[PDB]
Amino acid sequence: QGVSDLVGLPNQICLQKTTSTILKPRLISYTLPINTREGVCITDPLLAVDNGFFAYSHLEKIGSCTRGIAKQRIIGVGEVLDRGDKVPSMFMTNVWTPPNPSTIHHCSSTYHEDFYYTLCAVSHVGDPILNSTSWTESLSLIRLAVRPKSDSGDYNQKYIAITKVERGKYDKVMPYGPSGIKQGDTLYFPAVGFLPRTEFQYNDSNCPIIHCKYSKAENCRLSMGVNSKSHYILRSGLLKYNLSLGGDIILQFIEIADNRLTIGSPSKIYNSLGQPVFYQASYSWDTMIKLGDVDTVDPLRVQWRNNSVISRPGQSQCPRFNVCPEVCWEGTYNDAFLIDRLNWVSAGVYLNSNQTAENPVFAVFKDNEILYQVPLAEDDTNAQKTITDCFLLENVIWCISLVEIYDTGDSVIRPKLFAVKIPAQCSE
Amino acid sequence: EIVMTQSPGTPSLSPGERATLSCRASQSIRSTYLAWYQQKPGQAPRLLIYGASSRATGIPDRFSGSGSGTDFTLTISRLEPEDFAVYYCQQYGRSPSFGQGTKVEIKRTVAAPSVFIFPPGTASVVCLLNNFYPREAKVQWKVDNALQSGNSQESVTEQDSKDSTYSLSSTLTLSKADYEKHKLYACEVTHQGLSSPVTKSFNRGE
Amino acid sequence: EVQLVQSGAEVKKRGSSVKVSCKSSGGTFSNYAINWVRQAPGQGLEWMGGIIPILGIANYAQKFQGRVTITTDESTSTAYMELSSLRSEDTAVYYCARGWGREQLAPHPSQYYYYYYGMDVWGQGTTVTVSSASTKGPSVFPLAPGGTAALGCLVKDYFPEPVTVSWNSGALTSGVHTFPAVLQSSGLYSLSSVVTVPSSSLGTQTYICNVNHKPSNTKVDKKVEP
Ligand SMILES: *[C@@H]1O[C@H](CO[C@@H]2O[C@@H](C)[C@@H](O)[C@@H](O)[C@@H]2O)[C@@H](O[C@@H]2O[C@H](CO)[C@@H](O[C@@H]3O[C@H](CO)[C@@H](O)[C@H](O[C@H]4O[C@H](CO)[C@@H](O)[C@H](O)[C@@H]4O)[C@@H]3O)[C@H](O)[C@H]2NC(C)=O)[C@H](O[C@@H]2O[C@@H](C)[C@@H](O)[C@@H](O)[C@@H]2O)[C@H]1NC(C)=O
Ligand SMILES: *[C@@H]1O[C@H](CO)[C@@H](O[C@@H]2O[C@H](CO)[C@@H](O)[C@H](O)[C@H]2NC(C)=O)[C@H](O)[C@H]1NC(C)=O
Ligand SMILES: *[C@@H]1O[C@H](CO)[C@@H](O[C@@H]2O[C@H](CO)[C@@H](O)[C@H](O)[C@H]2NC(C)=O)[C@H](O)[C@H]1NC(C)=O
Ligand SMILES: *[C@@H]1O[C@H](CO)[C@@H](O[C@@H]2O[C@H](CO)[C@@H](O)[C@H](O)[C@H]2NC(C)=O)[C@H](O)[C@H]1NC(C)=O
Ligand SMILES: *[C@@H]1O[C@H](CO)[C@@H](O)[C@H](O)[C@H]1NC(C)=O
């Protein structure tokens, strides 16, 4: 009843392959504050959905998405509800804006009872991925009540700078990804560690170059960094924040295991039908989608699917469906949400192009076949980053998808949000 | 990085008539990313087509765009005096590139070159090819028995305002030292509009 | 209504550098892109690069990457293109042109793509000669001549173009061809201007060519006679 997590025994969904269009996307970007004007880019988006609530974030800057002057950073929370016509909508209820919008980077949100806790990086040198050596590690926490109050002190909004971070042997750590999970009173955020390339142990014999003629054995190791001679390598994982502790907040870094290892990239961890799932973006030579059931969270190990149908666009070195080790840092973030564990079928958006960020398709797929899909825009639509999150409305599976697009109507690079019901039958 | 090849290079065809010039890319490209430009004699280019079919602000309806994929086509419906110029196709976007250009010549009746020769520490012998058509014509310098190589320079006019012909000046530059060592100087002119090669010649004297 | 205005023709030594101006007369650079195109004498157009000022981004073709800096000054509504280490191959005419330019999402974690569109507004062009030779005047030589004769003037060995030629002090026009100049391996130019006349009139009339090369401020006026 109402809007709930994807748990229990949902209504049935079509598990057969069909080339008919049976998915019917909707625009729901309206009850949100993305109010358009040209000259601006709206970048660094974030979407999270948990227990009938949501977190959202973006950075609006004037001019270039890269070099433009930052104007406003939004971190908002609200409810996911039925308008009355059995279609889920998003209603912002509590919005936080920092005083300096150029300093917040790489936010990540996880929900726990009364709040969304969103963990961000504070930087005075731009993106720490690009200014890794210049970035002094500074992490902040913005905690937002999903249902604010009137005379509640700092119950509504609470900003707090983290001083105690256990990073192990990594020089610094950072949130990297849109959303994470709770386990009891312990929160886990998708994150990344910066390791000096000098103390990175990696047997080059592990690099899988069998029947990969033009691939050398070093390529794996060299691809663990933003480029072949980067000072750091990036190792994905989790940042753990245990709410039961009390005292000065401690975050603790948990590196991801080295099976199907690829360069640290924006990832996300979420619960589906009882159990945690991990998606890691393929920013490297391993361009087939990286997702799977979490075996253990701490230490973090992931049973990656052997998916042979979903990939991501790249560039001339590591384009779509590339599978041989190369030295590259290319690709996009396009996550997927487990909606049926028995058949392991997932829902998500991919970019139907080999070397260009365009043509976003919402697809329901299994490991070796796409069951069904629908384009979300036109053939040539510039689109890059997609965040898909599914849930239940009156026990029917719905997915909300954030897609970062070029909007032609206002000539603005911006996020748009789509709601897709997953149909019961395979035939109209 | 994309390479555009145009064709033909030098089409010759008559005024009032229709014209079609082809542009082909070494890659398949979206039609949105293609333009046609016109460069009249000795001045800046101007934009005819963009998106492979659209005439711009202030353009006559003669010009029409066509094609997609790898093949594209510009079309002139009724040619006119000003429509005789060079035409470039452009693929644009990330790293734009032009084709080598198509220059639409004037079609006219074949003419024959009037061939003249002029004698001079250096000396330069000149050979003039006055009022011929079409442009294609060859000049071979000749000393006593010699057929020369890589010591001659060539210059050509554009088509005359009146009769739409070409003229040519070839020039043989050699030090005055080797001027007295040889005796006969000739220039052989092969052209389509003459029966067989004409040759004007002289020996220092008269 | 807007059109662009470029700097004056330049002559520069081999190894030197050039900075060509291109200013917007009517308005600001507001959101358009300024492309730079070049044309080697007697050759076709090649895109060198472009700039989109409202984004603060420049992009270049590979052939000119490193050698070309495309800058702006929005105070002066003025773009600049600086070429460095000039080789003889860079002797050309450099146009600045204006068209739309759009920032696009790329399949890269940080990169953005930048799209330069068809160019609809053109500057007049700026000629840039690169040569080790120095300013010099031309030597004017005559070329004297069965029912039609030809005579002419040879304008030899002048470095900085151009030179101008008239016949009979600009009175003789019909049947005249002044040829496009050629460059000798001396680094100097040489031209020929010729006239067809009736043979009957080799004695009746007297023909005088007027060679006038301003960079040296020459005005040799030489006759022609059998
Ligand atoms: C987008 O990229 C896709 C993948 O590119 C491949 O991977 C990259 C990293 C690089 O290595 C490329 O060289 C690869 O092509 C393209 O789809 C692939 O197309 C190729 C053929 O062009 C397919 O291959 C076949 O693979 C089969 C097994 O899966 C083989 O049975 C088959 O072998 C037979 O035929 C080959 C010659 O083709 C001979 O060896 C023998 O005669 C043998 O009998 C092929 O080797 C590959 O499977 C495709 N991968 C996919 C679909 O994931 C794609 O190109 C398009 O592919 C399909 C959809 C057609 O429409 C093609 O015409 C089309 O080009 C790229 N898309 C575009 C637009 O370029
Ligand atoms: C990495 O840090 C340096 C230093 O903060 C950045 O360089 C600055 O760049 C801006 C934008 O052009 C200038 O206004 C500053 O004057 C520069 N400062 C210095 C000290 O050079 C650099 O841009 C950062 N890298 C990225 C990708 O943002
Ligand atoms: C979060 O912190 C609490 C508080 O220290 C931890 O709770 C302890 O857990 C151990 C083993 O589970 C018990 O033996 C203690 O009695 C617990 N203490 C209290 C006060 O309850 C908890 O384990 C921490 N969670 C994580 C995931 O580390
Ligand atoms: C993806 O494929 C791999 C390889 O087949 C699977 O990993 C192996 O599975 C076998 C069982 O068939 C085990 O004996 C091995 O220990 C596994 N690991 C290896 C070889 O490194 C993997 O299980 C597949 N993924 C899923 C989700 O089943
Ligand atoms: C690296 O690989 C070689 C051979 O595969 C092996 O002998 C060596 O022990 C490996 N290194 C480590 C640290 O295990």
Numbering used by the authors:
A (entry chain A): 176 to 603
B (entry chain B): 1 to 120, 128 to 213
C (entry chain C): 1 to 145, 152 to 232
Text of the article:
The henipavirus G glycoprotein engages the host cell membrane protein receptors ephrin-B2 and -B3, and this initial interaction is believed to be sufficient to trigger the F-mediated fusion event between the viral envelope and the host cell membrane leading to virus entry. To fully characterize the binding epitope, as well as the binding and recognition mechanism, we determined and here present the crystal structure of the complex between the globular head domain of HeV-G and the Fab domain of m102.3, a close derivative of m102.4, featuring an identical heavy chain and a similar light chain. The Fab binds a similar area on HeV-G as ephrin-B2, which is composed of a hydrophobic central cavity and a hydrophilic rim. The structure reported here of the HeV-G/m102.3 complex reveals the molecular mechanism underling the exceptional cross-reactivity and neutralizing potency of these antibodies.
We obtained two crystal forms of the m102.3/HeV-G complex and used molecular replacement to determine the structures at 2.7 Å resolution (in space group P6122) and at 2.8 Å resolution (in space group I222). There is one 1∶1 complex per asymmetric unit in both crystal forms. For the remainder of this report and figures, we use the P6122 structure. The long protruding CDR-H3 (23 residues) adopts a β-hairpin conformation, including a stalk and a tip (Q105-Y112). Notably, R30 on CDR-L1 forms salt-bridges with E533 and D555 of HeV-G; Hydrogen bonds are also formed between N31 on CDR-H1 and E213 of HeV-G, as well as between R102, E103, Y112, Y113 and Y114 on CDR-H3 and Y581, S239, T218, Q490 and T241 of HeV-G, respectively. Interestingly, Fab binding does not induce any significant conformational changes in HeV-G and the r.m.s.d in Cα positions between unbound and Fab-bound HeV-G is 0.257 Å. It should be noted that the same 2∶2 heterotetrameric Fab/HeV-G complex assembly is observed in both crystal forms.
